[model samples]
Target: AEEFPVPNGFESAYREVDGVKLHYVKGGQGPLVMLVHGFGQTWYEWHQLMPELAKRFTVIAPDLPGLGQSEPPKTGYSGEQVAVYLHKLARQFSPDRPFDLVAHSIGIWNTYPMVVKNQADIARLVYMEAPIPDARIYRFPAFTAQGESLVWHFSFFAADDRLAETLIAGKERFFLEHFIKSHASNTEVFSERLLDLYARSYAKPHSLNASFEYYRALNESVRQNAELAKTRLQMPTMTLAGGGHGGMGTFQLEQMKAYAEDVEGHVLPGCGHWLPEECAAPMNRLVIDFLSRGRHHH
Candidate 1:
């Protein structure tokens, strides 16, 4: 069993959400801030930024069902269902007050529906990089080099008969390293040690299949989002995109604008899909300031 260092002052723990055991790291106290990470990574990916946010908030980063040390979910893997599980976990921290939410990559896919349906439970929201599945996803490049560069895995990962899990079964390290490097502008941000840790996490039993489950439900998530988009998010929202090559660019920001009313957006210069990792320092400063804005007036 591989172990990563937890942020100072934070402790590792577990909670049961809808029959799946969630492994998370948390510390500090004030308002609640939940960090949901992307695919191929775990809550530990937030280890570097947790202490900074923990200074002013009770920050919790939970490994999504079937990733990291978390158990596989008995429920479905659609974004709406994933959202319900995470929303339930966030409420456990501060049920009586609204909380701030931040998500990245597929994390947005997993949690965006919760925001659509539980507007009153959220104080502010920040969704970075990956756009949730919408009708437009069907239009991304498929037969070009750019397709391989950007979203080739979307189809492969969602392949029927567990094709992705089969092909990637014994090659987790090789595949994950390439996936991480291809999507990051600064390739050096992810060290070999970190890469090994992530590979080990996904190498666990049922882990590979479980991770692919998110993509398998893409069609359902897209339909749910299309319906949910009819009602724009009322919370103050911030959208961050990366301008680097192969990054989502401002596409994610523009997408969010169509789904939210009050929104502020930015493009992290030279960063890629790994926002919190590739651009941790700037992200830390920006996220803290953005999340702190209105709360200080009280």
Candidate 2:
């Protein structure tokens, strides 16, 4: 599994949208379901969940622009701006019907605006961990050990003039392994092969810099959400978060409650930040059961 091959029945493909060549894996059938990966990860992170959803629905997991095999977007990296590209991709595939969205970590931040702007275009949303930029992040203490351990990277990654990338040069593997492991309660789940694959992805020219753009655009994203969230999402939304070390626990759920109307979620006990991999079985079950239900299945 060194290459983390695309699962059986799925095909690797690319589409040009929003001035970028977006790489994605597409397979399964029935209603469209889009899975978006987060920072330090690519579409490959959804490998486990893709097969489960592919059993009953169409799954399209794309590498966020400039993160994986995808070409860097000429457009800015604000969550609001990124949302438009993903929305176009979704609408291109399921023009006649609504699609479900599942996003993890920064993926959640980038896609939240898509749900906010085009509520009817997206039927259901499943977001795991990672807080969308908001005033609340200012409240995170800087000196506390727990606080620094949790978010020390936000500032480091967002540093000006690509200082983070410059400093991280030739140390992508070491930095990524440490950063990723620090967030996982079950570090054993991350094999050396997967870590190497991620390191290779980030080592590409401009890839690390491109990823940091998300953090750089945080201020604008927060502002965009403030106005976009004014209307609130009317679609049915499901939230999942890890309950163990490095997890946001109920923080993500609390935020979604205010931004969305109909919402329900779970705080997976003993799980960590990497819900898709760290707690795939339970997360898959929850997502499948939720998306399988009719809009009014409550």
Candidate 3:
């Protein structure tokens, strides 16, 4: 198979929004498609999917505040706060046209409130390997609940910024190993260069702490979601679930449907949380199809 690298035809830029400088990548042309990365990751996570998506649309991927190449803000790490920041960023990019949104993991949490509040100029939304709590279909504890109890990494990093920075700096190799073994579907699928890139990115000053803050924002997101539930999304939405045990499976889809009028869900047979890396081709195809199908109506 071909080794993954930063997608072709993509160019990087930095934009100042909400008192923070965010790094974003742009590629291809046509309608705008904005991609948001999840917790503990940066815009780099979208590398595998960008090349293909770029072929069909103008793909704009940004590292959320504090992650990737973006500068960390002094405060406002909650999802609702970040949503406002993203809305400001989107307005700057596409003042005249609506865009499609593709998000992963916690990125979806930010998008949900944006869609609910009608803050995003989005025609459609696609979420890969994201978890949303719903009681009807999913009969288990919320991922946050379980993550808080068992996933020490989630709680640990969010617990203290200085501690997280020190730990990640001292044990970068262990961080890579844990992500590869637990999050990725196939460890051997990643190249040494790709691994190095992730490691180096995290090692950047304040990057690790910013990543933890993204997770720390979860509490704010949950509160925001409760308030947001009062409104309904007016756009088409799709959620792609990975097949891993911790993945969305059936329950997440049902819950997602409750929030949007036009909602659909699919399961990637052999993928995990790292959908962009493990199943980029299929994920890209699905996003393109969703956008194309929703274009005429919007």
Candidate 4:
């Protein structure tokens, strides 16, 4: 398969938020909507739904720090830090207004910090296949079983900039291939073009170190959340799972309910880990409808 280039008319721009330059694409006009992509992917992941969502609301999708077009910071690279940066970014884009948020996988985990900290001026929250704390099963075991190895947890935490740069230079393809293959319903779904885009981003000069920093920050952020579980989100929330992957079991939903009193869950048929791309149309429908529900209804 060939990779698809970002479509025409989608202009890209950058803004200085926090300590880094945030790259974002904006379209449409109405209630603000922010889309955050997961690990290894860029704001381009939202391409499938942007036009549809744009029809009704102002849509802004950004390449979160350390990935895509966003510049990486020299320090403070934790998931919570990234979330803080995004919160600031949102405010810069729409000062004095609350926006709706949609995030996928690791993006959800990062954004949760903002929600729990009551830092997000969000009207509605949509989390697509984000991994919540589930000790019963190993994270991404299916991918692991398919010979898609992850960086050793301990080493990942200890990795310095130099080591990250060296390892990524030689093995960037391994990371890209593993994610694309494991998540796609069929191997054919990942075209050469897509892999090329992933390669281009992953192999960018200092990107490997930036990507590893996300994992390090994730561990620290989750630990902090564990200690402060009493804080809850007040906004309406929706979580979507893919039926094919068994990754979205009730345990995740139940855990989410502990922190989100107004939470609801849905399972999409025939899809797997790649929800936004594989099930974009249906996923978008679910989000639009969920956001439309009256306050007293859900």
Query: Each prediction's Cα lDDT score?
Result: 0.86, 0.87, 0.71, 0.70
All models, RMSD in angstroms = 1.7, 2.3, 4.3, 4.2
**Candidate 2 lDDT tens digits, 1-298:** 2234889999999899967898899999888999999999999999998888888898999999888888887788999888888999888899998999999999988898888878889888888988878888877655574454688688888889788889888999999999888898889889999899999997886788888988988888889888887788898899999999978999989988988889998999988999988998999999998898843212
**Error in Å for residue 199 of model 3:** 1.4
Which residue pairs show backbone clashes in model 3? Answer: none
- How close to the true structure is residue 84 of candidate 2, measured as C-alpha lDDT? 84
lDDT of 1 by residue, 1-298 (tens): 3357787788889888888788888898889999998899989878877888887888999888888888877888899988888999999997999999999888999999998899999999998888778987888777674455488789999999889888898899999999999888988989999999999988886888889999999999999888999898989999888888657887887888888899998898989888888998988888888998845222
Over 4 Å off, model 4? 1-9, 133-165, 294-298
Model 3: per-residue Cα lDDT over 1-298, one tens digit each: 1112456688888899878898888888777788998865678888777777777778888887777777786557776777877777877877788888888877886666766776358778887766542222123333564352224455566665467767777777567667655766655556777777777777666777677776666666676677788787767888887776335566557677777787898888777667777777887777778777854322
TM-score for candidate 3, residues paired by index: 0.86
What residue pairs clash in candidate 4, if any at all?
A: 1-191, 1-192, 2-193, 3-193, 3-194
Looking at model 2, residue 90 earns an lDDT score of: 87
Error of 2 at 91 (Å): 0.9
Candidate 4: tens digits of C-alpha lDDT, residues 112-193: 7776675358888888776643332244343465564432332543466666566658777776786566655545656677
Give the residue spans of candidate 2 off by over 4 A: 1-3, 145-147, 295-298
